[PDB]
Structure formats: structure tokens, C-alpha cells
Amino acid sequence: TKPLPTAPMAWAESSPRELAGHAPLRRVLRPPIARRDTRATRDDTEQAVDKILRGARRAPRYHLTRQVTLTDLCQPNAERAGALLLALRHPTDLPHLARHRAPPGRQTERLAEAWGQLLEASESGCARAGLVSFNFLVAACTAAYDARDAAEAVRAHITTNYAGARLDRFSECLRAMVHTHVFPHEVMRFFGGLVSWVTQDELASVTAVCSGPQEATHTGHPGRPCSAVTIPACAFVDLDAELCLGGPGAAFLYLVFTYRQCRDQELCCVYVVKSQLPPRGLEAALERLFGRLRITTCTYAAFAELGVMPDDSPRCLHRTERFGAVGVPVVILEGVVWRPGGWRACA
Amino acid sequence: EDTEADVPVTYGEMVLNGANLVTALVMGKAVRSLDDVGRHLLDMQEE
Amino acid sequence: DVEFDALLGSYCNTLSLVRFLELGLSVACVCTKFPELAYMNEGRVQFEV
Amino acid sequence: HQPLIARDGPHPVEQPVHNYMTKVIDRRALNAAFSLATEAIALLTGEAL
């Protein structure tokens, strides 16, 4: 209720050039060149039309992508307010390509059987299946990658909410893909943050952020009567937090797939790295920290940049959220801006 | 057929007001006509 | 954040009370309230024709 | 709430029965869209006049 130091609040509690712009330009006439010498329902309708008034009186920090998919893989309801959705593209190549780009000594028939088998396990018509969730990868590779039961706690989450078959079928696909030189990347690009699903039966319409900040979305305590919002890594198993040594800078968020090429029999590792390095410096630090280079070709990891967390500090690690009965180390990331980035792995 | 015409009507409206708001925040619960439903329970034990 | 849960109505039921003197069937019989039948063994009716 | 019939003989014996039950509201959302060309915008604001 008013301050002592007035000048700082008129700007805080709250153009004239555009007013002056039309003033010389538009106010001026015939220039240029010169010559010498109905209680509630009614209220609602009126407001919708009016809303079209204000929004049509004017006119960028947000982008929404929207898509319809099935609930076979993925599943919006199990997931929450802040979640990574990864797209999956063109099931048509049941290893059709396996024919090529597959080195000899490879039974390229593995994918077609692994994958077609996946379909039997879980036709084309009304919709297609895209949108793999971040969650569903953590469980599929849970037993594959390094930490178990912090990792398997995520697997308990998906079997009880999202089927262990599909996880196992999809894991067989990841093994078969990493086998034949068709990788999980060059598939599964980043899609968004999962604003609102709107599902019906086996169908889902998923809105999610193409890019822009997350926290500024549907917001509220939670989006709709669900819970809060966050980009919680979902693993104390994922959220490899680099910058063991660090100085304040905007943390960055990348997506890395680590593989095993007969060292472990086509290992799939999927996690997120959070440190301040611009992609030209991440390839170096990815060379270190990794002994997965086993030739036992030489293409160990492939990474794309999700975006920025233009504040270092929100990196909460919580093994504390329920997506049904199951509990998961959950790391909360406070504030995120999404830069989709591109996939770079040459080596 | 009887009449080709008839005597229909318009809309009924529910709103949270007064002690419905106050129970929709600090609590998160609401009941239709909590005013009378509430004061028929208070009357009831006052006799 | 606001979210809530509502109770959107209560509906109860009225037991009808059927009297039996308000019926059709009451014609076909004579009714008397005899409070002492508990205390009686044989009751009879004479019928001379 | 449900009624009874008092009845005689080798029959079990009636007790009033009261059934209580709640139901849940089925939530949908109807939606429609319209749209404006790029020309219409900026003509209506006053931008291109």
C-alpha cells in the first residue's frame, strides 16, 4: 500500500514511442511530397467473445506441439506434470534397412523378428504409436544400465501403471537395434514436456511443449487436479550430474545413450547430463568418464541438447513421488528452458 | 397427437458462494446448498 | 492453486404406507380388533339354516 | 429405503433394508474451433488501414 521510495515501484507495480510513432506518421495527412506556398451461462458466452476481444486487441517463450497416439507404449496418465516425451519414428522399417547399414556377421533378421514380435505382444488405422516416455526407457534399460533397484524402482512404477511384456519386448528391440547399427537414436528424438494428455480409451492426444520454459505452462499447484509441476529426472539413476567441480553458470541438459557392443551384449544406457559445457565441450567430457568404447565399429554414445536450466541450483534429487503404489528416486529440476537441439554422435 | 406446442423452460445454476468458497479453499470440498444443508443440521440439534 | 471435490446432491426415498382398509381386498372379509385372543382357546360361530 | 411384509409361518423374518449408494460425475469436454486468415488479423486491429 504505497512505498517511501516511489520511483522503484511505478516500474515494479507495472509504447509511448508507438504513440509518438503514429503521431508524426499517421496523424499527418496526405504526406508526403509538398506543394510550395443467463446468470452464469450468459456470463460465460459474453466472456468468451470478449476474450476474443482482448486477445484480438493485441498481437515467444512457449511452443506447444500436439499429437495423437496410443497408450501401448508411453502413457500420459502414469506420467505427470513435468516429463520428457521422446518421439519414435517409422515402424515401417522392421529392419527393412537392416538389409543395409548392417555389417556382415549380423543376422539382420533379428529386428524384424524382435520388433514384429513386439507388435504381436502389444495393424494401422485410426492412430499410430509414437511418443515414447522418458520413464519407459529407464525401465526398459533398467536392468541393462549400471544401477539396480533405484533403477528397478522405476521399473516397478511402469509395470503397475503403464506391462512387463512390452518392457521386455521393447528391451528386446533395443538390444536388437543396438545390435544391427540402427541405434535408439536415429529414432526417438525429443518431443516436449507433457502439458496435457486428454486420453480416451486406447487413444491419447498429448499436448507437450516444443520449446520454451516449462514452469510457465498450465501451472497452478499442478496441471489440472493432478500434482504440481517439475522436470523430475525420475532416476537418482539417471540425472548423472556432471560438474562435480563447478562455478555458477547456467546448467545445461543433454540426453545421452550409452551402449555396450559385446562388452555387455548391446547395452543400452539412457540418462541426462547436467553441467555447464557448450556442446563442443561435451564430446570431450563424454570421451572421458566412459570406458564403453568396446569395439570388442566405434560409436559409443549419441547426444542431443534438450535445453537450459538458467539457474544452477534447482537440482533436487527426490526418491519421493508416487505414480501409483511405486516410489521412485526422483530428482526435481527447478526451471528449464527447452532448446530441442540436434543429435550429434559421429564417434 | 395432443398439442403441437408445449410449455418448456430455461437454465438452473450452481455457484460456490460465501461458505462454499471458504470450504473450497482451506479445505477443498464443496456441497450443494451448504447454507441450508448446514443450518438444517444446526437447527436439528438446537430443537 | 484451487481444486476441490463436490457433493452434487442427495436423494432420499419415501416409504409408502398401505393401510388395507383403503384397499379392494377389504371387502371380502369382516375385521374386528379382539385384544384378548391371546387368551382364548376355541372361538366358534353358530350358523343355523 | 425399502418396505416389508410381516408374514406368518415357517418363514424367515423381515428386517427393514436401507441401501445407500454414491455415484460419480462423468467428465467430458466439448470443443470447437474457428480461425482467422492472416489478412484478417491486422486489418481488424487497425494495423493496415
Residue type (1 letter), A341: G
Instruction: Check whether the bond before A3 is cis (ω within 30° of 0).
Output: no
B37 vs chain C: nearest CA distance in angstroms? Answer: 10
Residue A18 near residue A24 (C-beta atoms within 8 A) = no
Q: Which residue of B has its CA nearest to A38?
A: B11
Cell numbers at residue A64, please? 506447444
Are residues A270 and A144 in contact, defined by beta-carbon separation less than 8 angstroms?
Answer: no
Coil, strand or helix: which one is B40? helix
Query: Which of residues 228 through 247 in chain A touch B, CB cutoff 8 A?
Result: none
DSSP string over A26-95: IIS-S-SS------HHHHHHHHHHHHHHHHTT-------EEEEEESSSS-TTTS-SS--EE----TT-SS
Q: Whole-angstrom Cα distance, residue A24 to residue A29?
A: 9
Distance CA D7, CA A158 (A): 58
> Is A131 in contact with A69 (CB distance < 8 Å)?
yes
- Residue A155 · residue A170 · CB < 8 Å: no
Round to whole Å and give the CA distance between A209 and A191: 8
Give the C-alpha separation, D18 to A266, whole Å: 64
Contact, A125 vs A63, CB < 8 A? no
Task: Tell me the structure's resolution in angstroms, rounded to a single decimal.
Answer: 3.1
Distance CA A73, CA A170 (A): 9
Find chains touching chain B: ≥3 CB pairs under 8 Å: A, C
C-alpha cell at A217: 505452462
Sheet containing strand A301-309, strands side by side: A212-213, A337-338, A301-309, A251-259, A268-274
Q: Give yes or no for C21 touching D (CB within 8 A).
A: no
Provide, as residue numbers in chain C, all residues whose Cβ is less than 8 Å from the Cβ of A220.
Answer: 1
Residue pair A239/A272 in contact (Cβ under 8 Å)? The answer is yes
- Cell numbers 486428454 label which residue? A198
Q: Closest residue of B to A42, CA-based?
A: B11
A247 touches chain C (CB under 8 A): no
- Cβ pair B30:C7 closer than 8 A: yes
* Contacts with D41 from chain A: Cβ below 8 Å: 56
**Would you call A41 and B15 a contact, using CB atoms and an 8 Å cutoff?**
no
Angle, CA of B34, A42 and B30, to the nearest 5°:
20
Do β-strands C5-7 and B29-31 pair in parallel, antiparallel, or remain unpaired?
Answer: parallel
Q: List subunits contacting chain A, requiring 3 or more Cβ pairs under 8 Å.
A: B, C, D
The residue in chain B having the minimum alpha-carbon distance to the alpha carbon of residue C10 is B32
β-sheet with A132-133: strand ranges across: A132-133, A85-86, A190-192
> What residue of B is the nearest CA neighbor of C7?
B31
Asked if A240 and A254 touch (Cβ cutoff 8 Å), the reply is no
Rounded to a whole number of angstroms, the distance between the first and last alpha carbons of chain B is 53
For C1-49, the three-class secondary structure string (H helix, E strand, C coil) is CCCCEEECCCCCCCCCCCCCCCCCCCCCCCCCCCCCHHHCCCCCCCCCC
> For chain A, how many residues are written?
347
C-alpha cell recorded at residue A4? 517511501
